[PDB]
DNA sequence: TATCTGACACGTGCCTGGAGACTAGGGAGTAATCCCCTTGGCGGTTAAAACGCGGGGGACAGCGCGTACGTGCGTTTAAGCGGTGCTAGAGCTGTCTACGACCAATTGAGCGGCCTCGGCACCGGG
DNA sequence: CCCGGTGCCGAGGCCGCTCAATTGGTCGTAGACAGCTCTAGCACCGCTTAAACGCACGTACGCGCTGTCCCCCGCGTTTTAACCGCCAAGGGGATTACTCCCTAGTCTCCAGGCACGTGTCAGATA
């Protein structure tokens, strides 16, 4: 609750930068070797991914609340992904 | 100018150069850029009104992304318009 | 690699998302989901880039890729 | 050499909230938002033109496109001010 | 399900469409094809809605869809 | 000629058949009114855009293509009508 | 063969595609090979979807394809379904 | 009043694939609308690519990249293969 | 199950979109250069994360009771067919002309640097 | 932290260079308007019967409750790499200039496409 209010109040990014950058680069390497990413583009992916993720958890929480539970579960995320399409 | 001719702050000429360049149609009507510039002026005016209100409520004289995010998400119509929109550093509604 | 998304990071994310209690499997599921989402966005961004015969993904590349996903991103020129 | 709407957004800011500033980061958001809305309306109007097989994007096209993209009351005010400006432009 | 024959009655649906239009601008006509297209779109949309509502109901370990389910589906559809 | 409350024209058996096609088995009574509301909202939205299209084209007759375009606005592309 | 489609060994009309591209104001100029490529893609996709439609009709022992079959094919194939998952088919029905 | 449609070509492709199989008028109409829809979507994407790269002409390259974007993985790959093959075949003559 | 049939398949006739040749120009391919951002590597701090433990709030199961929904039967309503008759409006063509495209010529608005200044936070003492 | 002064640095004003907006005029034609025409829609009328409405019933499901058991949360402690700032260099994005090559455009030529007229079998009709 306190953490919920604290984080929802601010707009600082949550995922540590360098790890996320390494993730993005790993995926890109999987697609096509020796690509380069501007720090700006990695930041853009950071923002988009974090916002998307946040929305996903919002929907998952809605589903869990609907199911009378309080603890989200993989089932909830499956449902949120499915309905939204 | 032309914007002056219409009292709009937005660049009629700029909008007109864009309508032509972006190949939206063979030709472009004379009043079309005027109308479109006025519309853009109105929409930005509404966004900025709400942002300034939020900043005042937040005790800040300089607007920042979070303020835009709040303004957009709070207003029903705008939120409907920008529902698919994610704002850099926007944060989320409390 | 993917596991760089620390459990606590997901906890913070969900907190911002309003969640209050989270099951253990949530972490792995979220990790996989985000992996898929990125895979998609980066595929599209890399394609945009390759078409421009460039070697460096650019912020605009990602912006368009998200635009295709119905994910308009503001604040990147 | 690059374009933007930043200065015009700033002028609007002074029009509406004389005593308020805006972060460059926020000006970027404002600029991209204007670009997005402009592009949406323009493409919408282009389709209106092609759809009825006319080669001219006249004010009428933009009016209907706005009436389509925006929600109800926002569309009402938008069309109001747009038509008003168009009239004035012809007046002078 | 096995078939595709329309499910909402034609004429009542037509009168519904006309009534709705009556609140936008009077004396508008509708090509029978337009009415058919609207009916097909509504049928598909409602079938999708009920599929989603059924998913939600199963999720809640219930069997009887309830308006709460519909609300949930509409909301998660963003 | 006037019109009235034709929303009820979507009779309970109609909605029940709809849900059946959707795989639902058991339906609460409260559903019927809610579904009637949702359908009304959906039609309001689509018809608003279709009528706008027609008005722009200086016509008095909503054509199937007009509804098709309106649906496309909603992002619900429709086939089989041109 | 004078017709470009024949030159490319495609049943679709290359010339029609080119005309549409120019007339549809997608760009000022249209590459010579662009209509060729696009027509090839369109023919491929139509052939693909019709493959599954015909197979479904065979399963239904029907010589003629009908919207029911097209709906079946689109919904059953994961890829097409993803491509056309946001679509509605006149009298399409839905998968059991 | 002449009116365009791909019904003839769709019918031809049907003969190619399921030669012993007919098609209803409604199904043909659906196919016609489907072809128009994808043609339009690919053309729009190619146009946006052109204008993104500040290039004034839609070449084969743009359509290729557009197909790679719109279509899903396996379909995209197969279509790209088919398209490049057809372009090569055409340029050969 | 004929049969018929009109829905698909088939011929023919027209013609209109498509194709080929030539031209010219500007648009795109190429290279050459400039220089910036990108990576990469290190060391230092330290906040961030990783791990363990304890308990307890919450998920899950089972049970019991009530009741709202599915089923059926009988009764009622209007949806559908046709059918028939009228015309408002779509569509198509023909005419005119007001409006937009090009371009030549001029001007100051906008762009970017330059400076400067205090609002909001840095900074250095309480 | 506070706290006044710093400062700084992002806002904000100013400067000047300018190149894109403005303006004029011309010419073309897209678009406006009118006239005709012919369907496609509307209504209305009667009829039929299929569908819908309502009643009654009972029972399967929702819902509340309990009661367990255990999976997360919070805390503490220990480990880590994320961030940092620097610096080095170098790959490529940006910019420009130049060439040739492709495509719009035209004329000109004609045959596949499409409509319309016609035959005939897969499936609907009988």
Residue numbers in the entry:
A (entry chain E): 48 to 132
B (entry chain C): 16 to 109
C (entry chain F): 25 to 101
D (entry chain D): 33 to 124
E (entry chain A): 55 to 132
F (entry chain B): 20 to 101
G (entry chain G): 14 to 109
H (entry chain H): 32 to 124
Please quote the paper that reports this structure.
Histone H3mm18 is a non-allelic H3 variant expressed in skeletal muscle and brain in mice. H3mm18 contains 12 amino acid differences, at positions 13, 40, 53, 58, 72, 83, 124, 128, 129, 131, 132 and 134, as compared to H3.3. H3mm18 formed a nucleosome core particle (NCP) with histones H2A, H2B, H4, and the 145 bp Widom 601 DNA. We determined the structures of the nucleosome core particle (NCP) containing H3mm18 by cryo-electron microscopy, which revealed that the entry/exit DNA regions are drastically disordered in the H3mm18 NCP.
We obtained the H3mm18 NCP structure with a crosslinked sample, prepared by the GraFix method, at 3.6 Å resolution. The overall H3mm18 NCP structures are similar between the crosslinked and non-crosslinked samples. In both H3mm18 NCP structures, the entry/exit regions of the nucleosomal DNA are drastically disordered, and the central 125−130 bp region of the DNA is visibly wrapped around the histone octamer. Intriguingly, the EM density of the H3mm18 αN helix was ambiguous, suggesting that the αN helix region is unstable in the H3mm18 NCP. Since the H3 Arg53 residue is replaced by a Ser residue in H3mm18, the histone-DNA contact at the H3 position 53 may be abolished in the H3mm18 NCP. In H3mm18, the neutral Cys40, Leu72 and Cys83 residues replace these basic Arg residues, and may reduce the histone-DNA contacts at these sites. These histone−DNA interactions missing in the H3mm18 NCP may reduce its stability. Similarly, the asymmetric DNA detachment is also obvious in the H3mm18 NCPs. Interestingly, the N-terminal regions of H3mm18 were flexibly disordered in the H3mm18 NCP. This suggests that the interaction between the H3mm18 N-terminal domain and the H2A C-terminal domain may be weakened in the H3mm18 NCP, and thus may enhance the DNA end flexibility.
